[PDB]
Symmetry: D2
Subunit: 462 residues, 4 copies
């Protein structure tokens, strides 16, 4: 009845979104089990959550779980291209404030986040934060510090965001405790790796429809994202080469059957065109950045790439690729939304039949979400079940209600306990129809664990 506290592309997409949410719920048994387990107790009654994460169908199931458990929320996306407009519409049609659409400008992106922070032109009385990448966290600390006085905690989704939290902690500028949701095993080693395996080749196919088999790829980075991305491309038949600065991750790449190369001669990046391995890059049909670092696909690399190579980024921020250089020097031809040919023949105009161009996906933004739908529901199930458990834990601790001196001992960045990590994993396994074996009492004693777990020491790397 007259609900207007939202901003989306097209509200008439709600029915479509609701049909896909109903499907996603059946693909998300950990999250839906939390919804059924905690609905009666209402553990988030009184929670007012500021949320900033890609407004996908999967985020929708997260949002409605939080609400089902008693929370009120205000939501935005954490990327200008990652929203699914039918998902945003369905959330708005349910009476939940949401400000998100695919294809936002940077100005519109900032406006959307501020519409969650401000209700009727004044600070909302928020008391919790859910974030993916740290942009909302940064705005609260820099622009709305007084609002953090009443906030009990932050649950942070992704590697880059965790890094920004830890910098604030070391510098003494973090105002509230956080849970690092990224480093649950059912998050980092599920979402970060297997998610990109599913969705990297997905986005490249939808953007270009290029055959990948038999072609040459260079993947920059071999962390969790680089591992899944490399697998995404190798399993399609690409000849994949991997770059790394971390020798242990490079050792893994070698043992996984990849050739380890550097874009720079002897791996020495002195900033000149001369240090580029021109012969290597002139053979590369596809380069993918996965690092969370800055300028790992730089201007000289872009100048040396094989004609018509595809360039994309699947790390959190677009500065992994020197796109600024390309805007300033080369002419952009839009093929379709989030697909651009970049003509290296000059800046003023281009020949429509020019052969010397590069194809950039999503303007260098997260490519799995920009050109496809990101990770699949059954994978995000694990990530968003951790999110819900982390919101419950920090809300229940009530950090904001301690005295100055009690906050001081509680101000940290923590992960969830392994027992809960395992309980999330068990529901995911059951979702596949898997059957976990149960230790006998003598077997539990033999290896020194409790029959119900946890089954590994906190040092275990899986």
């Amino acid at each position: 009845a007259g609900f207007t506290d939202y901003k989306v592309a097209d509200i008439t997409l709600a029915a479509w979104g609701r049909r896909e949410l109903i499907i996603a719920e059946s693909e998300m048994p950990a999250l839906m089990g939390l919804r059924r387990k905690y609905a009666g107790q209402q553990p988030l009654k009184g929670a007012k959550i500021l949320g900033c994460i890609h407004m996908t169908i999967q985020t929708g199931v997260l949002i409605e779980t939080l609400v089902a458990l008693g929370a009120e929320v205000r939501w935005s996306s954490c990327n200008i291209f990652s929203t699914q407009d039918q998902a945003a519409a369905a959330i708005a049609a349910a009476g939940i404030p949401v400000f998100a659409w695919k294809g936002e400008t940077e100005e519109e992106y900032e406006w959307c986040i501020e519409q969650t922070i401000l209700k009727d032109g004044q600070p909302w009385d928020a008391n919790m934060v859910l974030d993916d990448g740290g942009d909302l966290t940064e705005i609260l600390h820099k622009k709305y510090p007084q609002m953090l006085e009443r906030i009990h905690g932050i649950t942070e989704e992704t590697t880059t965001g965790v890094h920004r939290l830890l910098d604030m902690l070391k510098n003494g500028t973090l105002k509230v405790p956080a849970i690092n949701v990224n480093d649950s095993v059912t998050k980092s080693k599920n979402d970060n790796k297997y998610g990109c395996r599913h969705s990297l080749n997905d986005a490249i196919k939808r953007g270009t429809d290029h055959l990948l088999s038999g072609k040459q790829a260079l993947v920059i980075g071999y962390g969790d994202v680089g591992k899944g991305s490399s697998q995404s491309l190798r399993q399609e038949g690409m000849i994949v080469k991997v770059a790394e600065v971390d020798p242990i991750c490079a050792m893994q790449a070698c043992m996984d059957g990849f050739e380890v190369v550097s874009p720079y001669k002897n791996g020495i990046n002195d900033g000149t065109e001369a240090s580029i391995d021109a012969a290597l890059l002139g053979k590369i049909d596809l380069i993918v950045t996965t690092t969370g670092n800055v300028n790992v696909c730089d201007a000289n690399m872009l100048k040396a790439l094989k004609k018509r190579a595809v360039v994309c980024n699947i790390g959190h921020f677009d500065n992994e690729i020197d796109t600024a250089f390309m805007r300033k020097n080369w002419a952009w031809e839009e093929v379709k939304p989030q697909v651009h040919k970049i003509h290296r023949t000059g800046k003023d105009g281009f020949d429509a039949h020019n052969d010397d161009y590069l194809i950039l996906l999503a303007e260098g933004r997260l490519v799995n979400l920009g050109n496809a739908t990101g990770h699949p529901s059954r994978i995000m199930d694990g990530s968003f079940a951790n999110q819900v458990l982390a919101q419950i834990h920090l809300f229940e601790q009530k950090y904001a209600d301690l005295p100055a001196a009690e906050k001081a001992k509680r101000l940290s960045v923590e992960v969830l306990p392994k027992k809960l990590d395992e309980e999330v994993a068990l529901e995911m396994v059951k979702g596949f129809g898997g059957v976990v074996t149960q230790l006998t009492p003598k077997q539990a004693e033999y290896i020194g664990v409790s029959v119900e777990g946890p089954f590994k020491p906190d040092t275990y790397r899986y």
Copy 2:
């Protein structure tokens, strides 16, 4: 006139030396340490008791320790894992070694004793290198006085670490230890990729069975289980995985394996009624990888498909209830370390009976028992860590410290990540890989030194 050894055949020494020279070219991290530390002689004065599979790879480790100044006395940590040409060549170099392929249990104990004792009295050892904890246990239980002079233990494998931690928790650990297993250049190299190379290797040498198109069940999905599953799936087996750890089970699913339990609903009640007989009746090959007890039990063995292969790649053979098979069924040796177990009864067998199982290596570590274990280029990473761990604890001189200082240092620790990275770097250069160097701005951006360490200690890789 050197005679302080016992091996199968000293005339194999020339063959062993030829393979050691090749293996040196496959082990650049370990050999890089040998060249790096030869001048300093950091192990001069060290007297190391060593108990680890007497392979060609262990041979390269041994000579590196000696080149760095150590004296050693050596035995194998398994009755079937020795390569007799490796043993012969080490003995022919004047290094005390007591090991041969095919030891009895009695002979296995004698071999360890012969390193502990020299000329009838306890050797003046001051260091221990162990794989599985058998030597560590014999020292604590039968020779406690010798631990008064020992500076530490460097332990190779998951099971051995578990035994250390249990001793520490119980106040019975007498000296400090380094957990060599949990270096990333060990656990996530040796344990996983080593078994990937050597599991299917050992099954082929033992049976020459085709694997593509057949059904396997891998019990466990830790590091060894992950690598063993891959060893079989890459050959084209249809692989199912069992686990008690739901996180490891999650990894198996996402890796494309069906996760199942030998027991209905995963509940083992000790009766035949709880066995999933339909599942096991379809399994051509079962591999145990757990470090646990009786994970392929008698009821499972009674239910396996006729002619299935049974093997264990965990450290100890009690993963399989072989004792039950010895008591109730008739064993027919096909050839060394390959037996048909005839389920028709105890007293003799029909040579053309079709109701048998094939057991490899009598349930002992099958990659080392029926083949040669992990390849040189993989063991390179494990044994470089071993050398760095021996240097660190020998230089700490725990045995000489006053009691209060001992109490500060009586623990089980891992090597620093910086050293893990330097090992990995030489491994990568061995493949011809080129690591990229961060620029100052890039190192500042992610908050690391250009030289590393590149990850926090929490990182799981």
Copy 3:
């Protein structure tokens, strides 16, 4: 003032052209034919009726035929396979095209007729290019007099070749045909690797389902079934395979798949009792690849696991008993070409019902229906064969022969291996591959010319 077409939206032409320019750079064999033959205009005077999926790739084929001198009039061979931006770009270039995504059956027939008729009278066509045989059937059945002026037919796909051979068997085929399907650079490229690329693509676009760790059933293991199985296995699915051909089933076993039948003892007696209910109750995804009829039947659909995905990648939708589902179950459209089928009955459904199946493209070709079919660099091979096939038959002028000569010339043949190899070499070069040249001595050693053909006609690759 060009109006001789009908497409969804002419304003999509500019986008269509941008994707065509990219496709040209992905199709070197095809574009190579443009350059080699353009000066000689071998298709001058050719008037080609074309019926094949109106994709971007088909657009490059069309413009190659035109660049070599032909006139054409085109329709799609499937109601869902058209890319509307490709048909718009062809129309805007002045070429008669009648095709859009989401045709009805009536509209499908109307579109084909618009190519046969120009200004209400039969077009003066003298060549036919077909994919599935629908246009060929209509000509033989409804416009026989037109075949008196046609020099031949070039047929793209296995199902259409079968229908040509039935006519040749019966003596009702009026003009000769080239079987384009059985070129190696078609069958073992398009049929296999094409579905490998585009099956998991279409399933992801339609459902966004995770595939890793779930159970799939692929009916059939010919070229399409081989590629489809790989499309799913490489994603981490556990794939089971059904076959009626023991040789193809043997290959599935060796490729690492479990071969199963939907029916007990493999006997399909048409009763529920025949269905392996435990098997069907485990299956998350079933894909039909056979070119046969009712290989995913009513009893199988009734037994499928709740929320299973059902799709067909064979040419015709009768592989799946969708008529049963239309008559008995209620259909809920998720989005275009994605329907939930509620097994609770016909009279409505509960929006939160859990007992449903997901059908893609209403049982039509799923790679073209829910995605964009094969990628350009694969269709390069297929369509370079098409072009050469068209020249081959057109230059032979069957229609100008007397009846006695036609009888000797009537046939269904494949292109000579030499042309097959020439196409293949251009495909290899597009990957940057370098083929090695035989020395004279080596050529003589194996009994071939340095220029090929390199294999006898019996070779299977």
Copy 4:
């Protein structure tokens, strides 16, 4: 006792060979199915078969199937390194003439074949031939042409052998008809491909125990043997490159995810050191030849290969590699049997710690049989069921007893009917527990086949 008509390395190995034969019988259901189906009718009663094929355990089961169906045989191996001494001992212990052992010289190889041809110093009354590679066939035509007057046919196992038969037929020199067993689908696309997949990495591990993951391989050829060999290495994690002269096979290698390269610049082999791609070969850790051609790993390639590379051949004959050049110029150091280090520092003497060497396996002979045990029983089941069917067919045809005008009509090289190819496959599939579905009558009519098969036209390539 009394029986002395054989020559093997060590007769005391018979009991061990018998045990492995009993195991292999359970791995070979197609072959043991033929044994049980035809034992009663004794279709080979009166046949006297000269056999020349690798004296492995799998060949033992073939030999005893022929005898069980009524034949007498005299047997030798078709390679100096491929015999399993325990299989040879078991056959001799069963009273079957066999002349074979591992590690024959070239002279002993010729002697062994001659011992099958001659019994008691005069030609045996042979009337059938089973061959693998055509050596025995060539000796009969050249040195014992009168014996062919009594012989009803030849069943030839392998690609090279079939090639030699077709050239004799084209020249009018083939004296008896033959069955090309190689080109059954249950042979060529099972044995030649999947057999090398199983046995190539097997042999390299037994010989060197080298890690293969992360290393660079060059496979020369991509026919059936090259396809299986490339997969054998790739599945281990090797970075595999493929060379071919046939562009269709090259196209398959690209689509299968391999980079297609040539050892020669632009693929032009002009016999000069300048034509070698030294940068490419200086990066190769392992080269495998699979072609059935001559000198495809030549002297100039050998000179350019990375130090300590492994060199082996899995084609039928050793002249795929220029071992003669290596014998003439470099010093060979035997590591152990069938494993030699080839020191490129000179011909006379070597430094025991020299680093500039190559590792050659099996002296360039068939490496899977030389350094391991060849194909596994369950694969050879297909090959050898075809051999039994082919022997029965040609023996029952009785070519040597036909009138001249009938002889002329039947003097050819043929394959078995597709119906028998399918029947062999069915028993293989059942051996895995596979279940083949039966067409309904309607379905059979729809695709134009009989419910019983054959299911494909003879043009079908699978």
